[PDB]
């Protein structure tokens, strides 16, 4: 009865299938008429198993016109060449590799194959009843059977390899044609096709574009990712409304000046100097500028309908012509030369900015933007923060991008408040000006810390204890009057120094961001013997510590005088030390460095406490020193005993002296018995169990923690620590990893069918991913360099990366379906870069190697670069052989 | 033209004229003719202030004819427009660019210009009466006004940027035609001058070679350097004699079989593996097989006329075949798997010969070609030498390389007789040989050595004196100590009378410079590590292995015990290292690396299988005993210690002190011949240097004579008196540590500071990448070139240098420690930078040599970026492979591999 069919399908397949008023490509049901007749029915996204069945039911569906089986893996279409009434035909994102049962559907105008294999077009040619054909995303190399198929107004081919349009000069009856991401150097045929409404160029080779002069009808023109330098033929397309040639080679922008219909232009990766021609397009309501050298913005104040402006990468000085632009909602200006942004006030409907790498130091003037939801203000030399930034609908955040809805800070000298307050929310920065606002009405003079943990970094012990007594994990705490030098200097007789030395193992970098970055002064040890080891551990100040001020101190020199390291070089390339080199010799010049590193501008010196937060700082060193933790009434009895009795001050205090390293507190344990702890007690418990014993294989076992270290709650809590210091996980049954400890041996899996260098291998990047996929291993397969991985989602995906420490790269190797590996890379190398940003300043670049060999690698940014832009193929000479610059980046879809 | 005419030529230029027969491109005289008149002059390297003023005179020789400028750097040559009479011009080797006033002599029929800058070629379309053109190494692209001038027989178009040889279609008079070192790839024009007898056509992108199949008349054909797969074309020129198609892609040489009358055929660095057509040519003289897939030489046995074979670089087992070759003259078997070299004997007419990097174990077979002048055996496994090897009439060296008329030997595990003995030369090893026959006729058992060198590596004393207390107990500490006063080895009967040389180093390896076998032989390396120093791990692990080599290491992890996570991944070391033997120790609370150390001493490379003479022994024994007690020895005390033990020769004698030498036991120099100081305690010797280089008067590098009191004798055991003084500088200077400057003042470029007051015009920067940059390399390399450095600018990182030979010609080699390389930049012009490129490069390459597998990946920067370097591997790879674009994916451009590798070389 023709419904019963469907009942026959839906029982054949395992779906149901529902009525819509329209069939659509992802459309999963059907579509009858007055009298019950299915006209149209869809499959979207049910199995490559389906043109191989159910073709009995749509053969019985003898009123059927339109079809539609889009994405489903299909290799082979034959069945479907019975159905020769079929008018509209949905193949598009399946395997499809041959093309030849199209040929007797002589009744199609509607046909997609939007990313199959296919290589011959001749079937087409039949295909004489065709108005919109969709061939975009195959491996179409040559086309000639398209001038056959014409009255067609639709033609998309984009994403192929074809290198000559001659044939399409034929179809005169196109409305709207797409040929990106193709082969392309000579668009003369396209100089006919009239009533041309919509045309796509991008990502070619072309460089003449004077074909396109006479196509008056155009509308939307994209002509980005080329080679054009001469946009003369432009003067004449006055009905066109978007146009966006961005990433060419153009200079000169004045046949612009005639479009005065454009409202979306994009003209980014150039090299446009002089925005001057942009004047008459008073339509234009988006304009990208990104990647120029604009330096005086003058003519955009005419430009009263934008309302999405992108004006990055640039080299602008001024921003007042930008005032008069009161309907602009979306500002991108990072990375120019900004220095005041008062002229922003009178933006009131601007909504999202981004102002990153910029050279401002107020952002005051944009208190009164009440439609802000979400502006950047990275990278600026930013002191200091106006009290009215906690009246926003926005929460603030200390991250390296820009999100929306967020006031998001990074690489910012800020003293007031700190960076160790602006991570913690508007209300820990409410809570910091309500603090010294309540302490100077009470006629409190504000006082700073003076207080700096000194790393002291080095191979071997031999330099440090020679260093140890010179002056005077093991953390010692000793004041100014007991170093050798600044024994009676009344500048800062109140200065608190914290002597640190984790070897190699910096336990805080995962947990405390701050313990490493802020407050922290680190100290370089060399001598003759261990200067083969002198740019790794400069290194490893960098991506820990970043800002921070180094003293590179060069003892043991009375036994060598000949010893000295290039500080020229050396401090160009690490200008965190200031010049801080030091040789000592049988006069202390080295606590002169140690005072011109805690008064630093940039540290905690410069921030401005409350008298009350230091009483309550003192108070918490010295109970905790002698009592090891501190449970929370007496924490709450301590600052109640100070004027803190508001809980949002306590709670953003003891976070502020959580980040600083003075006194650990870790909210996301909330046991009052054990509320604050002292660092000396929970790193000397912590070292402990990590270079235990027990633990010399990596394993540990929960029922162990006695021995080695101390009640049982205090166990269960340094586990705690441990997890949140991302050093261990537990497994179950307590059986916990120490993922640093593990052995390299027994077992690995290189089967058959991406490396990423570092400048400085972090021995912390394994061990912490790979608690991150602890539920992914395959069955015990991790070790100490590397893991294996298998997912669950993706059927057929097996992961395997290791880290190669000689070389510092991590290399990852994945293998199963291209649609279920290419994903897992996708998942794994963000999860890496999700832990590589808690550095500062990694070069990562991403190698991948040459099929069938190795070694021999190419860099990912090269063969991306060799494509889009033209030419195919990657040249080895050392190899004397082409692998093709195509086939290799199928890592990626297409595009972006 | 008259004769007074060229006396004022050779007045105002200062050369002198003298009359030649027949003038010639070189020649610096006049020709002249019956009656006296100059009809030819030449001025061969005469100056670039030639013809501006000499011209006028040379307008007034009437009956002049034939006019040579060859090589004077000449930049303009408008004056000889006047000379409209001119038959023969030679302005080979200038600086030309316009060569319009060239038009006007519509008189020529020889014209060289072989090396100028010269683009445009158009005023030689009027020159419709020449027949020899010489255009070879130019800028020439576009060779289209060369069809007019249609009557020449010989043309050369060698090195330029020629891409379209259509133009030459119409020079069908041509017999002599070179084109090599171009961009051709269609040859199709070719396909006519059916009178061409010699044709050039190397480094070049030619695959098409059909159109060379209708010149008969070709005796003489160069196609290399190309892409070449299919030589069908080829089987019809049966009037070959010379054909070279080296650097191809050639895997069928059937065609070959046809050209019976080939002499000498070149085809290298191919893809050949079957020889068989080659049986034909009886008249093959000159072979050149190397870089093929060659694994059967059998058709080579029917060509009797071969005097040169060069079959290296292939797969050859199997070397029989070669016997019947009785006129073979020289072989070239290098690089391959050869391991019987005995059907090599029936060569009575070989004379040079090369079987170095194969698994040749004997070499007395070879003792019956008397006439062999240079033979080179080294990288194999060669263990013992026959006595009859200072029979030949050639010199034994230790180097590595193949120089003729010496027996080569590099990288072989000598025992009889060990290489200390034999860089000594032919002498030397028939001094030791004449020992042990002595000795075994006397009845004196032979005994060995059992004496080995501790070296202690790693990056701070803190493991170094922790690993000293393991065994007895414990800036340079040398400690000797026997096998029974080891913990480990107390009882041990094996080797109760074995020596441990213990010596720390402090990174400044003071003997590798001049005792090239102190790090490489009779030496055990062991590498402290503990739970901090795992850091600078790969640092030291290569820097024992181009120091040391082949040298057993053991590899001890110490204080496991305060952190048992502590372990390398022994698998991967022990594999990239080879010689650690899976050495690994973890020492906690030191007995298990005494059973490491015994099977490093008992090593079958080391010295226990040398046998040496029980005299040598007793001679040994008695000057250590003596040395260790009065520092040095004199020459009377030594010969009287040598004479104790029936050491009576002077040969033994010398070629003994230079064994002990060599070993590091005993230093003897004899470049300084002291009578009074000719025998040295190692001991004191580096502690007299040690205390010179960490002395407070070389903390800057410079050391004066006038204040070696200070250094030797007093500042915060040993006695140094004047004349000892005198010494150490000599051993310094010996040691390639320090140069002396003149006046007392010496410079120790190890001490130097790093200062600064780069480089602007024509730079040509050059990167040597390191895989292990030696702290040795630059200041070896400025006592190589100190007469060279421009004054008072030298530093520890680098120097700045001038040569003497090209004016102007300024270099600046700087290493970068932090990325262990060694960039050289020079400026000026092409000419003269790329020889000064090529004799620094050199002294670099002639310092590296010292040390064992160094990597060494030389780069090259793009010319618009000073960063973004790309490997010469790679240019130089894309010429054999047939390409002139290196495409740069990051930087979105297209750079011609022309272009950057002529500004390094050209002689390819």
Redesign the interface.
């Known amino acids: 009865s023709d419904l019963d069919v469907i009942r026959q399908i839906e029982q054949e397949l395992g779906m149901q299938l529902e009525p819509v008023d329209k069939l659509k490509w992802y459309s999963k049901g059907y579509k009858l008429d007055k009298d019950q007749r299915v006209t149209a029915i869809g499959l979207y996204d049910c199995g490559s198993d389906t043109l191989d069945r159910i073709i009995q039911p749509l053969e019985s569906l003898k009123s059927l016109s339109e079809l539609s089986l889009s994405s489903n893996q299909i290799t082979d279409i034959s069945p479907l060449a019975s159905l020769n009434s079929l008018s509209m035909l949905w193949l598009d994102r399946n395997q499809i590799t041959d093309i030849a049962p199209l040929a007797s559907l002589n009744s199609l105008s509607m046909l997609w194959l939007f990313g199959n294999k296919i290589s011959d077009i001749a079937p087409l040619e039949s295909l004489k009843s065709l108005t919109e054909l969709q061939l975009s995303s195959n491996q179409i190399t040559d086309i000639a059977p398209l001038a056959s198929l014409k009255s067609l107004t639709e033609l998309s081919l984009s994403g192929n390899n074809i290198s000559d349009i001659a044939p399409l000069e034929s179809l005169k009856s196109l409305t709207e044609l797409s040929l990106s991401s193709n082969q392309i150097t000579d668009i003369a045929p396209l100089a006919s096709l009239k009533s041309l409404t919509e045309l796509s160029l991008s990502s070619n080779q072309i460089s003449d574009i004077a074909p396109l002069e006479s196509l008056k009808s155009l509308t939307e023109l994209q002509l980005s990712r080329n080679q054009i330098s001469d946009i003369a033929p432009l003067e004449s397309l006055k009905s066109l409304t978007e146009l966006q040639l961005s990433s060419n080679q153009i200079t000169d922008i004045a046949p612009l000046a005639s479009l005065k219909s454009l409202t979306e232009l994009q003209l980014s990766r150039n090299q446009i100097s002089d925005i001057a021609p942009l004047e008459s397009l008073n339509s234009l309501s988006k304009l990208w500028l990104n990647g120029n050298q604009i330096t005086d913005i003058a003519p955009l104040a005419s430009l009263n309908s934008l309302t999405e402006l992108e004006l990055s990468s640039n080299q602008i000085t001024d921003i007042a012509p930008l005032a008069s632009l009161k309907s602009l909602s979306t500002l991108w200006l990072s990375s120019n030369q900004i220095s005041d942004i008062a002229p922003l006030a009178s933006l009131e409907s601007l909504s999202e900015l981004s102002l990153s790498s910029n050279q401002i130091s107020d952002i005051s003037p944009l208190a009164s933007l009440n439609s802000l939801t979400g502006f950047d203000v990275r990278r600026n030399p930013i002191k200091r923060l106006p009290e009215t930034i906690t009246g926003f609908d926005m929460e603030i955040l200390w991250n390296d991008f820009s999100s929306s809805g967020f006031i998001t800070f990074f690489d910012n000298p800020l003293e007031s408040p700190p960076p160790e307050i602006v991570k913690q929310g508007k209300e820990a920065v409410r809570q910091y000006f309500q603090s010294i606002e309540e302490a100077r009405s009470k006629g409190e003079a504000l006082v700073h810390l003076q207080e700096i943990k000194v790393h002291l970094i080095g ?5 440090k204890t020679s260093l140890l007594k010179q002056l005077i994990l093991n953390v010692v705490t000793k004041q100014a009057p007991n170093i050798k030098g600044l024994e009676n200097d009344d500048e800062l007789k109140e200065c608190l120094f914290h002597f640190w030395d984790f ?2 193992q910096e336990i805080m970098h995962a947990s405390h961001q701050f313990f490493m970055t802020r407050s922290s002064v680190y100290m370089l040890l060399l ?11 400069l290194r490893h100040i960098e991506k820990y510590g970043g800002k921070s001020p180094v003293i590179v101190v060069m003892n043991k020199i ?5 010893y ?6 050396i401090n160009e ?1 690490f200008p965190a030390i200031e010049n801080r080199f030091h040789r000592i010799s049988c006069v202390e010049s080295i606590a002169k460095s140690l005072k011109s590193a805690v008064l630093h501008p940039d540290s905690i010196y410069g921030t401005p406490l409350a008298p009350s937060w230091i009483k309550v700082k003192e108070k918490l060193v010295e109970a905790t020193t002698a009592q090891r933790y501190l449970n929370r009434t007496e924490v709450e009895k301590i600052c109640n005993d100070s004027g803190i009795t508001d809980p949002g001050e306590r709670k953003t205090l003891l976070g502020y002296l959580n980040n600083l390293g003075i006194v650990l507190y870790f909210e996301a344990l909330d046991l009052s018995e054990i509320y604050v702890l002292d660092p000396h007690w929970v790193t000397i418990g912590v070292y402990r169990i ?4 027990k ?4 394993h540990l076992n929960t029922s162990a923690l006695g021995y080695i270290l101390y009640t049982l709650l205090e166990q269960r809590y340094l586990l705690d620590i441990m997890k949140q210091f991302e050093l261990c996980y537990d497994e179950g049954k307590g059986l916990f990893i ?1 993922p ?2 593990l ?3 027994i077992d690995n899996e290189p089967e058959i069918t991406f490396i990423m260098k570092y400048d400085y291998l972090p021995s912390t990047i394994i061990p912490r991913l790979m608690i991150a996929m602890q539920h992914q291993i395959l069955d015990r397969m991790q070790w100490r ?1 590397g893991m294996v991985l298998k997912s669950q989602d993706h059927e057929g995906a097996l992961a395997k990366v290791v880290a190669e ?2 070389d510092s790269t991590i290399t990852i190797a994945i293998q199963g379906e291209p649609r279920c590996k290419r994903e897992y890379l996708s998942i794994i190398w963000y999860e890496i870069k999700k832990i590589n940003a808690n550095f500062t300043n990694l070069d990562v670049k991403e190698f991948i190697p040459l099929p069938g060999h190795p070694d021999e690698l190419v ?1 990912y ?7 889009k ?1 033209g ?1 195919d193929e ?7 052989k082409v692998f093709s ?1 195509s086939k290799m980046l199928d890592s990626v879809i297409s595009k972006e």
Not at 527 to 537: C, E, I, L, Q, V
Not at 690 to 693: A, D
């Open positions: 191979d071997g012990m031999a330099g070897g190699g001598d003759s013997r261990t200067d083969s080891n002198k740019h790794y551990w009375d036994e060598n005088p000949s000295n390291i290039e500080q020229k070089k390339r990590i270079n235990s014993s633990t010399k294989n990596g120490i640093s400890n052995p390299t041996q360099y420490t000689k860099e940014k090269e063969l991306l670069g060799l494509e832009m030419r990657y040249v080895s000479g050392k190899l004397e610059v």
